[PDB]
Paper text:
We identified C12orf29 (RLIG1) as an atypical ATP-grasp enzyme. Our biochemical and structural characterizations revealed this enzyme to be a 5’ to 3’ RNA ligase, structurally and functionally similar to phage T4 RNA ligase. Although the 5’ to 3’ RNA ligases contain the ATP-grasp fold, their catalytic mechanism is different from canonical members of this superfamily; they transfer an AMP moiety from ATP to the side-chain amino group of an active-site lysine to form a ligase-(lysyl-N)-AMP intermediate. To gain insight into the reaction mechanism of RLIG1, we solved crystal structures of WT (adenylated) and K73M Yasminevirus sp. GU-2018 (28) RLIG1 (YspRLIG1) in the presence of ATP.
In the YspRLIG1K73M structure, ATP was bound in the active site. Both structures were virtually identical; thus, we use the YspRLIG1K73M structure to describe the interactions related to catalysis. YspRLIG1K73M clamps the ATP molecule with two antiparallel β-sheets, a common feature of the ATP-grasp fold and the RNA ligase superfamily. We superimposed the active sites of ADP-bound YspRLIG1WT with ATP-bound YspRLIG1K73M. The pyrophosphate group of the ATP from the YspRLIG1K73M structure is not poised for catalysis because the Lys73 (Motif I) is replaced with a Met and is 6.4 Å from the Pα of the ATP (Nζ-Pα-O3α angle = 85.4°). Arg89 (Motif Ia) coordinates ATP-binding and forms a hydrogen bond with the 3’-OH of the ribose ring. Glu174 (Motif III), His195 (Motif IIIa), and the 2’-OH of the ribose ring form a hydrogen bonding network that precisely orients the nucleotide in the active site. Lys253 (Motif V) is involved in neutralizing the negative charge from the nucleotide. Superposition of the YspRLIG1K73M and T4 Rnl1 active sites suggests that Asp75 (Motif I), Glu174 (Motif III), Glu240 (Motif IV), and Lys253 (Motif V) may be involved in Mg2+ binding. Collectively, our structural analyses of YspRLIG1 reveal a minimal and atypical RNA ligase fold and highlight key active site residues involved in RNA ligation.
Numbering used by the authors:
A (entry chain C): 16 to 34, 47 to 108, 112 to 210, 214 to 276
B (entry chain A): 16 to 33, 47 to 276
C (entry chain B): 14 to 32, 47 to 107, 111 to 276
The structure:
Amino acid sequence: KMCEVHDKISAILVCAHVKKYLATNCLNPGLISAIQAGARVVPTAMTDGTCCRVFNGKIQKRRDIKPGREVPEGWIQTGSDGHLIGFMDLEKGDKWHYDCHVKDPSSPSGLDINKVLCITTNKAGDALVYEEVNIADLNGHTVELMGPKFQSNPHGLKAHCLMRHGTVKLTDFPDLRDYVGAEPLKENALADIRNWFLNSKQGPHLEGVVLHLDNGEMYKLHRHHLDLEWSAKSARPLDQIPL
Amino acid sequence: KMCEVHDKISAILVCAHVKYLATNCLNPGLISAIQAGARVVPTAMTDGTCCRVFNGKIQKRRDIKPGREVPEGWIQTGSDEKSGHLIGFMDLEKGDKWHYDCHVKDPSSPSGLDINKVLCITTNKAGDALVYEEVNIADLNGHTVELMGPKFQSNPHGLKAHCLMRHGTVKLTDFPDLRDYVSVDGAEPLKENALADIRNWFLNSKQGPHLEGVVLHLDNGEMYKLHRHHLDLEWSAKSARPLDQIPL
Amino acid sequence: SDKMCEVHDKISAILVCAHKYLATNCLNPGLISAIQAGARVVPTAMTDGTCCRVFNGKIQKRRDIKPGREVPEGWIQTGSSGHLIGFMDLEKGDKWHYDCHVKDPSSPSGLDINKVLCITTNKAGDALVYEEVNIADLNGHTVELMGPKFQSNPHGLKAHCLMRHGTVKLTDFPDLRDYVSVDGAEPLKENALADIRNWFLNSKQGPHLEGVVLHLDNGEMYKLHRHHLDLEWSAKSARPLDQIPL
Ligand SMILES: Nc1ncnc2c1ncn2[C@@H]1O[C@H](COP(=O)(O)OP(=O)(O)OP(=O)(O)O)[C@@H](O)[C@H]1O
Ligand SMILES: Nc1ncnc2c1ncn2[C@@H]1O[C@H](COP(=O)(O)OP(=O)(O)OP(=O)(O)O)[C@@H](O)[C@H]1O
Ligand SMILES: Nc1ncnc2c1ncn2[C@@H]1O[C@H](COP(=O)(O)OP(=O)(O)OP(=O)(O)O)[C@@H](O)[C@H]1O
C-alpha cells in the first residue's frame, strides 16, 4: 500500500536553499494538483539512516552517481535528479549493512542470509517492536537501515535493523487538504507543521514527515525545513514512539 | 510576577570552598527575608545564556571588569562582589547568529527574520506540561529570559530549537518549603537538614532530573539559587531528562 | 546478611558462546546441573561500572593480578584466563571511587568516610532511588560503582553511586528451568537464546540493562552481556537506569 523510494522526493512546501533553508507557506504545486485530483494523503514518519531495499532476497544499498562518475558494477537505475539515483548490491566492506542480518556462527558467512532484524509495528497498533523476520517478506520494498553505526544512532536503536518506509503512520498530523474553487480553510502550513513536530507526541521522535499518496507520489519535510534541530539530543528514542 | 535577573544570585545555603559545596546552613539574607514575612516561590533553573527583552529587542548579558571598556549600548544592572565584575546587558552584535536564531524566520523580511516574533518555551493552558510557542517579543518586553537550544551549553535540555524562557516560568512542586528550616519568632526550626532534603529532591523528585538547579523568587525581588554542583551532582545531557517532557 | 551472591570470581555465561563471543542456544552445563539439583535462580540486572566491595568500612576496588606481576600491598585474593581475582583498598589517585562518598568540607579528606551515596530499591519495589547510607550497612558485600566517570555513564546517573550486585530483580525474564530436562523428560521450551534476546529488545526492563546476571542459591552466578546477544550497549542505546520500571 505504501510507495517505494526510487527518486528524490520534493518538499511538501516550497523551500529555498541557502548555501540553511527558507521555508514558505506555499505548498508544492504537484501536491496541490494531486490533492485536487482526489488522491489520499497518508503522512508517515521519516527515520534517519541509509536508504536501502530488499531485492531478490538480498539487501541493496542506494547510491547516487553524479555526472561523469563511474557507474558501479551492479548499479541499477531507478530515477534521475542533478545526479543519478539507483541501487546496488553490498560490497565486502559493508560490515554494518550486513550486521542487520541475524548471526549464524556455524555458517561460512557467519550470517543467516535468510533472516534480518527489523523494527516494526506490533500486533496492536500502539508500539514498535524488534522482530527477526524472513528477508523475503521485504522483497520489492525500500527500507531504512538504522542503528549504532549509521548517522550516530539518533534514534537510540539497540541494534542495526531495517524499517519498511511508511511503517509509522502519524497521528493528528495537519490535514494538508485544509490548505488547498473555494479559498483554503487554513493557510499557515509551515507554522502548523512546525508546531506538530515541536508539541505532538510523535514529532519529538521523528526526523521528518514523508507523505505517501495514492498516485505513488511522495512529499517530504525534514526538521531543517522547519528551522528545527535533528540530533540524538533533540530526539526521543524511536522504540518508545507512541503509535 | 517573577523577579528579574539583574545581579549575581546568592546561594540558598551557605557554601564552603574546597569548588563550592553547599552546607546545611541557610543564607542569612534568606533567613532574614523569611522572618520578615516574604513569600518564597521555588522555580526551575535552566541552562542557557542569560538574556532579556529590553524595549523590543533581545539583549545579551555581558559582565565587565571595572578596569575595562564599556561597549556601546551596554546597560549596567548590578555588581558582583566576589569577582567585582559589572553586571549588565547589551544589544546583540552582528555575529550573534544563534541569539538571532530564536526569532521566527520570515521570507518577507530583508534579513529572513521576523524581529517582532520569537520562539519561546512556556507553560501550556492547563499547566501540566511545557510547549513551544511562537510569541510576539513585546509580550516578553522588560523581562529576563534564558536563551537555550542546540548551540548553548551543548543543549543539555534536549531542546529541538533555539528558544527563550521567562525566568521563573516553571514553578517547582514538592520542593522543600524553606520556612520549616528558619527560626519562627524564636523557636527551634521544624526541620534541620535543608541540604539533605534538597539534594534528595533533585535526585528522586519527578522534576529534579530535568533541572540544572533551583532558584527561589521572593516578594522582595530577592533571589537565591542552588546549582547541581553545589549539591555534588552531575549536570550534563546524559544526567538530564529532556526539559520539554518535564512534569508540571 | 543479604540473600544475593558476592562477586569474588569470574562469572560464566548463561549460554555456551562461540567465536567476539556470541551466545548459542545451549545452556551452560554447570547451570543445567545446578538447576536440575533444585537451586533457586534469581535473575538480576547487570549494570555497567566498576567492581568494588565494602570491606571493614572502606570501599575496595577489584584488581586482577596477571600471573607475571607483583601483588600490591593490601591485596586480598578472592578468585581465579590465568589471572587471580582480588580486592584492594582505594589508592590516593582513585578520585572518582572516593567521589561516591558523601562530601564533608569540614573533614580532612573532604569526605564523610562513613556514608556513601548508593542507588537501591525504594520502600515499595516499584522504582529505584538514590539513598545516602551508612557504609557499614554494605560491609562484606560487592557493589558496582557507577556514574559520570565510568564507561561514560551509559545509565545516565546524576551522581557517582554504589549499587549492591543483584539489587534489581528482573520481571518477565525467561525462567531457565523450562529449558532444562525435568526428571529426564523433554524440556518445556527449546529456544533460550531466542527468548532471551527478544527480552532485552522488547521487554520493559531490558532497554535499561547492560545484561543479566543470574544469582543461584548455591553462590553460583551466570551472566549474559548485550554483546553475547549481538546487541549494542551505549548511552544512546540505553534508557536511564533510574527510570527502570520494577
Ligand atoms: N517513510 C519514508 N518515506 C520516504 N523516505 C523515507 C522514509 N523514512 C525515511 N526515508 C528516507 O528519506 C529519504 C528522503 O530524501 P530524498 O529521497 O529526497 O534524498 P536525500 O539524498 O536525503 O536528499 P536531501 O539531500 O534533499 O535531503 C529517503 O531516501 C529515505 O532514505
Ligand atoms: N528560573 C531562573 N531564575 C533565575 N535565574 C535563572 C533561572 N533559570 C536560569 N537562570 C540563570 O541562572 C543564572 C544565575 O547564575 P548567576 O548569575 O548567580 O551566576 P553563575 O553563572 O551561575 O555563576 P556562579 O556559580 O560562579 O555564581 C542567571 O544567569 C540566569 O540566566
Ligand atoms: N547484578 C550483578 N551481579 C554480578 N555482577 C554484576 C552485576 N551487575 C554488574 N556486575 C558486574 O559484572 C561483572 C561480571 O563479569 P566478569 O567479571 O565475568 O567480566 P566482565 O567485566 O563482564 O567481562 P568479560 O566478558 O570480558 O569477562 C562483575 O565484575 C560486576 O562488576
